[PDB]
Symmetry: C3
Subunit: 149 residues, 3 copies
């Protein structure tokens, strides 16, 4: 009894992990996940940057970060409106870093941006052009999370 049931439950658990993995694959597929590509998702809600990070973090993802023109357009198409990117110069003014760490490689700044305008701008938004503009982290923009390829 005991040992047999325990061995069976281990098989039940492994079967459940396999099924859940399959469910996640199907959901990613229905969400637009392209083979071997990272995918972006949004609930179309606009909120302050701190809430986007908290939200993507709960979902075990990160605030969307374009690493090249392709991904930049991908995020643009997903958001449809202005959306925060996982990039800020909160730590050292003028030095934009990825929220995931490290200095910005690819960038697509609008002319004369980032400019830390007025009272200050430490966050970044991809606008309805794919271009970038630094804006107040307190402002509310579309939440777009990123998940691994």
């Amino acid at each position: 009894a005991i040992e047999v049931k325990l061995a069976n439950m281990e098989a039940e658990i492994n079967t459940l992990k396999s099924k859940l993995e399959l469910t996640n694959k199907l959901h990613a597929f229905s969400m637009g996940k392209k083979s071997g590509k990272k995918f972006f998702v949004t609930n179309h809600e606009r909120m302050p940057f701190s809430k986007v990070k908290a939200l993507c973090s709960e979902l075990r993802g990160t605030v969307a970060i374009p690493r090249n023109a392709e991904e930049n357009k991908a995020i643009q198409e997903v958001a449809k409106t202005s959306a925060f990117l996982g990039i800020t110069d909160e730590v050292t003014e003028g030095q934009f870093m990825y929220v995931t760490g490290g200095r910005l490689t690819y960038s697509n700044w609008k002319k004369d941006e980032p400019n830390d305008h007025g009272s200050g701008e430490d966050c970044v938004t991809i606008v309805d052009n794919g271009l970038w503009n630094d804006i107040s982290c307190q402002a509310s923009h579309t939440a777009v999370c990123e998940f691994p390829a």
Copy 2:
């Protein structure tokens, strides 16, 4: 050994439960669930009110109910077409009650409605412009379920 295997398996189960909960959160987010708000969703299928209640119940949700103008708009954008709301005046004519209990607070009736037209109309549908019209519960309208915030 047995007590050890059992302990390790309970750990695996706790991890799997959290992982499934994450799947549910990501899915709701991808379908438009806003922070702190109820999740509204539809399969675009039109059916009699009885079937809508049965369908949402089977999913552990309930027929969508607008508690205010904001929710009414959210349901409107999910349905696109005429859809049943979880409200009826089956007990006392003219007294609309939520199928989950309690008297109707917010309402968005169309002009000249409710009119308990013809042989009688005890169900409610959100239609054009998001306004309401009472209709026969036997009529087929889009199924929209709601899940807790």
Copy 3:
């Protein structure tokens, strides 16, 4: 007590099985699955037929197969563009079969199709007015999977 913990583990597993089943039902509902009808899903990615089969197979579904006009319209609405169908005449030229078995019955060929054009065409794509054309299995078309009613 070992046996008490084992009994709890069984209940935890069964509870998990029930919740995962619910998660699958809510996802199918959100993807447009109609009561008693199979449903269709796409990530909008274009790829050769062999890749579509592999992808859908891995998700425990199959390349979409229209069995009547309703399903054909449904697949057309989901795909938005040209997509492979689970129909080919690879096994015996001229005789189309479903990838899951059986000779083609219902069909919606464009005029003058199928024509096994050029060096040959053994796969099938649903194109413009939801009409069908046989095409090379090597060409890349939208991946659309179908899942059981």
